[PDB]
Amino acid sequence: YDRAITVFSPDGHLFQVEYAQEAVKKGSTAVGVRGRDIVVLGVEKKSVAKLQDERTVRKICALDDNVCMAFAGLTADARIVINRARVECQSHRLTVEDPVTVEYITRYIASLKQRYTQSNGRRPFGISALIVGFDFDGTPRLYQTDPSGTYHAWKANAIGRGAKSVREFLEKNYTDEAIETDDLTIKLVIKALLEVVQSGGKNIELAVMRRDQSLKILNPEEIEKYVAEIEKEK
Amino acid sequence: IMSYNGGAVMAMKGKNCVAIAADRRFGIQAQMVTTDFQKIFPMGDRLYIGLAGLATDVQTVAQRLKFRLNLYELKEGRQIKPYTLMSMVANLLYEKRFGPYYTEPVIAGLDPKTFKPFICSLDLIGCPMVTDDFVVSGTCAEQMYGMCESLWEPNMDPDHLFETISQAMLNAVDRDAVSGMGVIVHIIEKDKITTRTLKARMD
Amino acid sequence: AVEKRITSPLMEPSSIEKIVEIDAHIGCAMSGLIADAKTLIDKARVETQNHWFTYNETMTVESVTQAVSNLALQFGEPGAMSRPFGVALLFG
Amino acid sequence: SPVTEDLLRKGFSCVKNELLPSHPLELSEKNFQLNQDKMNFSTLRNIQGLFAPLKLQMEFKAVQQVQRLPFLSSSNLSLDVLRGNDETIGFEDILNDPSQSEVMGEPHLMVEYKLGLL
Amino acid sequence: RGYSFSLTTFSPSGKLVQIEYALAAVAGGAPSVGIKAANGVVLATEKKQKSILYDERSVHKVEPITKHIGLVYSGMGPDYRVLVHRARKLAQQYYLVYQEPIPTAQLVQRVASVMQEYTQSGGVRPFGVSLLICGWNEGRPYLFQSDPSGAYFAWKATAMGKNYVNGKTFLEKRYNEDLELEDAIHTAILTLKESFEGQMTEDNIEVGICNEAGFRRLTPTEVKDYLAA
Amino acid sequence: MFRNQYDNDVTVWSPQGRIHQIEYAMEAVKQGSATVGLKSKTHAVLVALKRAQSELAAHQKKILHVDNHIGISIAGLTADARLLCNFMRQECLDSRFVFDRPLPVSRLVSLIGSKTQIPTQRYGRRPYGVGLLIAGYDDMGPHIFQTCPSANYFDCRAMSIGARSQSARTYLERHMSEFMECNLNELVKHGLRALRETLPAEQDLTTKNVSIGIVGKDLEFTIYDDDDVSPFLEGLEERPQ
Amino acid sequence: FSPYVFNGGTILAIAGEDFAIVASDTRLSEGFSIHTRDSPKCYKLTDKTVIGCSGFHGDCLTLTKIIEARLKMYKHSNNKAMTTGAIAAMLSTILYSRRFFPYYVYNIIGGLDEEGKGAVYSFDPVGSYQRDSFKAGGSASAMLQPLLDNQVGFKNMQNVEHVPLSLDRAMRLVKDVFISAAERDVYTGDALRICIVTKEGIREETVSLRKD
Amino acid sequence: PGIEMLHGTTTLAFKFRHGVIVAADSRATAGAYIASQTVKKVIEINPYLLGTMAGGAADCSFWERLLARQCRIYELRNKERISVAAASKLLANMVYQYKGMGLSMGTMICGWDKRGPGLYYVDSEGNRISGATFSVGSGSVYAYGVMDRGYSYDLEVEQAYDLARRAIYQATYRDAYSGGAVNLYHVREDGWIRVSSDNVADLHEKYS
Amino acid sequence: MEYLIGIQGPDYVLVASDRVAASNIVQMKDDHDKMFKMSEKILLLCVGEAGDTVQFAEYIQKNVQLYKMRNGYELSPTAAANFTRRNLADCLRSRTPYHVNLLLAGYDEHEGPALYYMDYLAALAKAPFAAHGYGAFLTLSILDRYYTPTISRERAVELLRKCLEELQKRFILNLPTFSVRIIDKNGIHDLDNISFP
């Protein structure tokens, strides 16, 4: 009973949504956690491909000077969603002189996703987002979209394949002490991402964001230094 | 309406040589805001166009014509014959015949295959016409036919052609308030393009 | 009184809210699918505020249940829907 | 005459002069094919019966929805011999040919507007 | 095969079943031969109107376009007149602007695009037809052949149509360039003779030349003269 | 069993020749409650019945309102009921606004049938599932017009389309002689007695399961409910047997 | 061509303690002639709300025929009856719907509030309601109002007490004011039609006025 | 038809260390005949903002009603109070949508929010100028000078009330359209509170 | 009406302004910054009809940030000018009888500074020092007299001060105080306001 979006099953269980979720649970992982005044959005690169240039292929896209973005899944649909979100953010800023809050833009993205599930002539967007940024009141915020229509104000969740292990590791270590300073959050997220990946430093990227300092990616040298510092475990 | 700005352009056909010249000035009626404002566009290599009139439409028509010329050149492969641009601009102007533009373009160039000089002209809304000896159009249209008709001569070498195009403009454009203060002369001989800048009365 | 069934401890408790305001004197408890309930709630809010602007008075609960049911009746064949709304509400 | 009951996407168009026609050859040029088809349909419905306009217009509808997506140029090879303009070249294709459009919209937006979802 | 029956779906090897079927259909038609020579081109074909009940006038195959472009079909009869009318309309549309006649290549590209446009869509069959067109521009002769999907080639001695493999094999050992129309016409007649199922008659050949005068179509008595000679 | 391929849609004819969807909809309309539709010389009573989702919940609405001189009942699907009564109300309002006379029933019912005839032909649409019992007096005595799932309306004198009602039809046909000269009370008593046959044995009509509605000569269409229906439901003899 | 023409009229409304009164002269006059002498200008809407509509007699009919239809729609939808506090806003919205083609009317609404209380509203041709107590208006206005201002709400008077308006006084005042103001105006006179309304229904009233 | 209402009026509003104060008259004229004496002009849209009235009457009322609906919708959606700047820009866009068809309005949306006070101004022309001292309408002048001379940004509450009363009275004594009653409005953290209403005759008697 | 001037130089695009409002006979506000900001290197001066100026500037300003945020890098002054002119022409001719004057600025990293003059019919020049408003008539000659082709940043302020003193002394209106901003290869620098007691 799974050949069209509009149809149901004898029990319920709208199946195209579940299949889209299964498709989403196939790409590279992604994490994120907020602190006192800090947010990290680390991801992991599946393949090196030294001939390919890492400049063009990337996941941490910028949505505004106070909102950033990281996806997981099919690339083209995510790019389309990010483009639409950028346009909507600029339009809202034009119509009201106030920097856009995280909740409004994440609701817009969720609605745009949900709109493509109402007729058996358009496939749903199979991706998952990790919208995170700083509001206009200074309160750190984080969210997570979902292919069907939903979104939750998570704290330190994760998406992608093999997300149960990293989620358990994060929930078994997340405490107020680890979110006090700045580099402690980086240490925590690096320790979290080091699990699924084979060898650290080679294919791990971070994006540290501070209070109104805009998105700032990290060069490989700083990543190697942070891994070396976190390697002093005893 | 071609008085909110200024402009004047000629074109003379010599002996395997064509010359086009303009006047550099841009000002809002009596006032003047700048002295350098190009009115000659390098479409092709041995071809040129001479838009002259209201500037705010000159820029737009030049941009659209350049776009369409690039499209045709890329699609059809080889260069554009001088006669084709004539119908090009005619169609482009008649596009908005009811909402007319304000341009009196002049086209002057050479055939890339035959090297036979060609000169044409256009009215406000597009009415193709070709004159063998010379043509002129601009804000100061009246005070140039008299200067050009007597001074012209058939079968002129490049030096005499430059002298005649200089003398038919330098002392014939100062007899008017607007459209003065500088003259650019473009001489297009068989093998190399050459540009010169005259000096006139600074008033 | 509506339960929540939090999936993980890391999820913020106030992120999910089955209880939702409709106006100063009307509240409802959604169930089942979430996005469709959000769409219905948004339409109900727009309708009641528009009615307040037009007739300059307060809502009557039947006068908004009728509107939301009329909207939900459009299942069938234009941003028209194509499947029944798999949701349920307890207007109060 | 409607109230509000995104401005960057569609903006800079005052309400003043769309309810004020331009040069009188405006409603006879913006809507020409529609008016000609309406006149022919009315004539046929008056003189030949009610079947012909219904049949012909529903044929138009059937043939209209097989073209390429809106964000690309439409050949429109068919529907032309059926319309009757098979060789009636005029001031509709030589001036501002839609193939070389000077301005172009986004693909998803244009297709979703063509579907009428917005 | 479930992956067949619809032109909008790829078979799980990489192909389009409907396009190949249409190509086979246009292959199963009427033989046609086109020869390009240093002075001009010749297009030769034969008609199925063998019985005397038909007429020489009225219906006709090699319809000229403007003055320098002439075509010939080798597919479905009632399925290329619309295409020919579109080609003439496109030629005139190009002629009003750019006051100079259409070069062949632009016309080929435009007709190929308009023909392909009924491939990528969904719910309409592709045209079953494949047509050669000959031109004469810039003191040069041009020959092209169109495919049902649409992919022009700068062919020189194509003998596409029914039993076209034999025609190609025969032509791959006769043409040698640097020829006038006199020998080219005889070569085309021999190629048609190789596979005709009967003898050529006065009313079975529709040769048409495109020398540097236009697109004159040979009169029936002139065709008789060449056939005798 | 030679019908699986000829009933999946509505625009196909069986080899015998009959649209199966229409028959299925006419069978579907039998899900609901009985509704008698008696009439007299001066008044046209319209007595219905109401079900109960549960003892805690409240009952459904079976006697809607259309205008000052017309009131419809309902039987079957409750989805299309409102979608059709909207068209009812809009047409009546337009007829009152353009002209200045109440819209006669004989044109209104024809318009409703014409509207309901459209979906049974075009693809991708399904027939309606209502069992309307339109009643109302305008200018030439009260009328009782029935509507079916197919756009085939009947004129009538008294009938009880809806749930199990064949016994109701038999009772209504047995006593179809006195309905031409009686007062309001006697006609209402006859209607309630006819409805009582539908209700199963050892079950009486309470105050919360009747929706008597009356339109006549000098009174506009009014619906009665709750304790207000008690005066009509007093005599009713004592038991069917 | 000019899609406007005058037709005269006069509307007066007294909102007392538990009674609303709406009265109006009856004469359709345009240009210099007289069309009729009955032409009532006081239409009933509900059991406790009366509308008076002066001004051009081509929209005074359209608004009357639209308000009743919208009232029927509201009653059918919400299963109630519009109170006099909502009809004002609804009519204001309808009037403002054509701000670029204004209605040429001068409407007056009178009725009872939720509790027994007088209430008379007042509009303008563009449409903007405002609660009042004794507001009048129409063609022959600016004469009716000042006398009521002198009488109903004591203004520019000193050493005088305040007494609530009694029902016996209201009709006696209205008849006197219309009789006084009929002579000096051209468009008024003929028959006077009174629509006093209380909490038991609508009782009607007609008297002679400068017989013409 | 005839002139709608309110050919002109007066109002003022200044801000200081204890919020924003709004004052207004009440005389909705109709060209040359006084139509009313107690028409309220300080429009309430919620217990945080205070819409003002000027220019036309019906247009102002309708656009404040639409602004109130939009603000209430935003409140219900985003669970957070809307800033004054957002409402001002919204009204600016709606009014600027129609220009040249005869629109005429002057409004001085003001209130308290997370950034403190705010007294942005918008009209039919389309500008959205801010400020700390404002007065619009026909009787804006004849009051501008006095209220500019008295303003000190360090006043008390009673002194500010007296200043506003004096400014309105001196404006309405010299003009010919303002007058009637004087409404005085105060704004603070817990929303606006109505201060008092007064009649011109009593103020003239006590200021004589 | 208002006043806008901008003087070029070796490595600066220094622009002045006039912090003032307008009304019938009244000055609503005495400090209204007309200088909208495009990016870290581009300014946009705009004087015109009321409302349309602040609308057009807002629309054209929430469109250049989109390009930066969608392509990583930043526009160039020439592209910004050739885009603003096109938008202004298309919108003005479409349905609105606008009246807006603009004066772009900017400093790229390849060819010095760049100052652009644009009238209300959407023209585009590259004058080394332009002016707007009515004070242009009385001040452009003063600007032209002392303008050496190369001017040091120190002397530019003095030249501007003289050019504003002459306007404040010989003009009908009451422009009370002016704002000054100078752009270099470090961002958007600011200078103390010019106020005449």
DSSP calls for F162-228? SSS-HHHHHHHHHTTTGGGS--HHHHHHHHHHHHHHHSPTT----TTSB--EEE-SSS--EE--GGG
Structure tokens at I73: 């890098």
- CA dist F161 and F147 (Å) reads 9
Q: Which of A33, A151, A166 to mutate to test the interface with C (most CBs of C within 10 A)?
A: A151
Helices D51-64 and D33-47, interaxial angle, to 10°?
Answer: 150
Distance CA H106, CA H122 (A): 6
3-state secondary structure chain E: CCCCCCCCCCCCCCCCHHHHHHHHHHHCCCCEEEEECCCCEEEEECCCCCCCCCCCCCCCCCCEECCCEEEEECCCHHHCHHHHHHHHHHHHHHHHCCCCCCCHHHHHHHHHHHHHHHHHCCCCCCCCCCEEEEEEECCEEEEEECCCCCCCECCCCCCCCCCHHHHHHHHCCCCCCCCCHHHHHHHHHHHHHHCCCCCCCCCCCCCEECCCCCCCECCHHHHHHHHHC
One-letter amino acid of I90: D
- Please tell me the distance from the alpha carbon of residue A37 to that of residue H149, in angstroms, as a whole number: 48
Q: How many CB atoms lie within 10 A of CB H7?
A: 16
Q: Is A96 in the D-facing interface, judged by CB distances under 8 Å?
A: no
CA angle B34, B38, B42 (to 5 degrees): 170
> Which residue in H127, H141, H144 is closest to I54 by CB distance?
H127
Domains of chain E as residue ranges with CATH: 1-229 (3.60.20.10)
Instruction: Mark yes or no for CB contact B31/I137 under 8 Å.
Output: yes
Nearest chain I alpha carbon to D13? I95
Give the residue carrying structure tokens 């250049």: I64
Cβ-based burial of D11 (10 A; exposed 0-12, middle 13-18, buried ≥19): middle
Which helix (DSSP H) or strand (DSSP E) does residue C73 occupy? none
SS3 state at I89:
helix
Structure tokens at G138: 């129409």
3-state secondary structure at position F59? coil
Q: Are G11 and G52 in contact (CB under 8 A)?
A: yes
Q: Which residue in chain I has the smallest CA separation from H123?
A: I51
Q: What is the CA radius of gyration of chain I?
A: 16
Number of Cβ atoms within 10 Å of the Cβ of A92: 20
D19 in C contact zone (CB under 8 Å): no
What is the rounded distance in angstroms from the CA atom of residue H19 to the CA atom of residue H2? Answer: 41
Rounded-to-integer distance, Cα A144 and Cα A33, Å: 12
Residue D71's closest CA among D118, D17, D108?
D108
Burial grade of E121 (CB within 10 A; 0-12, 13-18, 19 or more): middle
- I touches which chains (3+ CB pairs under 8 A)? A, B, D, H
**Chain C residues closer than 8 Å to F124 by CB:** 77
Phi, psi of B119 (to 5 degrees): -140, 140
C61 near A CB under 8 A: no
Q: Which helix (H) or strand (E) holds G93?
A: helix G84-96
- Report how far residue A53's alpha carbon sits from residue I12's, in angstroms, rounded to the nearest whole number: 38
3-class SS of residue C1: coil
CB contact under 8 A, A6 and C83: yes
Amino acid, single-letter form, for residue H161: Y
Neighbours of A42 (CB within 10 A): 25
E121/D66 CB distance under 8 A: yes
Resolution (A): 3.9
Cβ–Cβ under 8 Å, residues H60 and H53: yes
> Does the beta-carbon distance from D5 to C50 stay under 8 Å?
yes
- D96 to B67: CB separation less than 8 angstroms, yes or no: no
CB contact under 8 Å between A91 and D108, yes or no, is no
Q: Taking a C-beta distance cutoff of 8 angstroms, is the pair G39, G62 a contact?
A: no
The conformation of residue H34, written as its DSSP 8-state character, comes to: B
Number of CB atoms found within 10 A of residue A35's CB: 18
Residue H39, burial from CB neighbour count under 10 angstroms (0-12, 13-18, 19+): buried
Yes or no, beta carbons of C60 and G78 under 8 Å apart:
yes
CB F129, CB F149: distance < 8 Å: yes
Amino acid present at H44: E
Cβ neighbours around A212 below 10 Å, total: 11
Residues 6+ apart with CB under 8 A from B14: B117, B155, B156, B157, B158, B160, B161
Spatial contact of H147 and H133, defined as CB atoms under 8 Å apart: yes
Residues of H in contact with D15 (CB under 8 A): 97-98, 101
Angstrom distance (rounded) from CA I96 to CA I56: 12
- In angstroms, the CA H51 to CA H62 distance is 12
C70 part of contact set with chain G, CB < 8 Å: no
Counting one residue from G and one from H, how many pairs have CB atoms under 8 Å apart? 39
Whether residue H172 lies in the annotated active site: no
List beta partners, residue I118: I102
Cβ of residue B30 closer than 8 Å to a chain I Cβ: no
Collapsing DSSP to helix, strand or coil, A12 comes out as coil
* Tokens 């239409």, residue located: G43
What separation in angstroms does the CA of E65 have from each of E85, E133, E135?
Answer: 9, 10, 10
* Cβ–Cβ under 8 Å, residues H99 and H124: yes
Do F and H have ≥3 inter-chain CB pairs under 8 A? no
Write down which chains contact chain H via at least 3 CB pairs under 8 A: A, C, D, G, I
Between A and I, how many CB-CB pairs are < 8 A?
17
- Pairwise CB contact (< 8 Å): I69 & A64: yes
Nearest CB partner across the interface for A86, out of I58, I59, I69: I69
Of B88, B113, B93, B118, the residue nearest B103 (C-alpha): B93
H143 annotated to bind ligand: no
How far apart are alpha carbons A44 and D74 in whole angstroms? 44
Task: List, in order, residues 6 or more apart from C17 with CB less than 8 Å away.
Answer: none
- The answer to whether I84 and I104 are in contact (CB under 8 A) is yes
Question: Roughly how many angstroms between the first and final C-alpha of chain I, as a whole number?
Answer: 21
Q: How close, in Å, is residue D29 to chain G by CA atoms?
A: 28
Q: Collect all residues with Cβ–Cβ distance below 8 Å to F44 and sequence separation of at least 6.
A: F38, F135, F136, F137, F142, F143, F144, F214, F215, F216
User: Dmax over Cα atoms in chain C, in whole Å?
Assistant: 47
CB pairs under 8 A between A and H: 17
Of H9, H11, H29, H107, which is the active-site residue?
Answer: H9
Residue where the block lists tokens 């054509």: G98
* Phi, psi for residue C53 in degrees, rounded to 5: -65, -40
- Nearest Cα of chain C lies from the Cα of A202 at a distance, in angstroms, of 29
Q: Do D5 and C78 touch (CB under 8 A)?
A: no
Helices vs strands, H then E, count in chain C: 2, 4
Residue D3: list chain H partners with CB under 8 A.
66
Residues of A in contact with D9 (CB under 8 A): 87, 91
Structure tokens at G68: 């009743």
Is C55–G90 a contact, with Cβ atoms under 8 angstroms apart?
A: yes
Phi and psi (nearest 5°) for G176?
A: -65, -45
Comparing CA positions, the residue from B78, B6, B80 lying closest to residue B47 is: B80
Residue in E82, E64, E78 with CA at minimum distance from that of residue D80: E82
The length of chain H is 208
CA B40 to chain CA mean position, Å: 7
Q: What is the largest CA-CA distance in chain G?
A: 57
Per the CB < 8 A criterion, the answer to whether E103 and E66 are in contact is: no
What was the structure determination method? cryo-EM
With beta carbons less than 8 A apart as the criterion, state whether H96 and I55 touch. Answer: yes
Q: Please indicate whether chains I and H are in contact, defined as at least 3 beta carbon pairs under 8 Å.
A: yes
By the 10 Å C-beta count (0-12 exposed, 13-18 middle, 19+ buried), H115 is classed as exposed
Residue D40 tokens read as 């022919």
Q: Report CA torsion sign: A158, A163, A166, A167.
A: positive
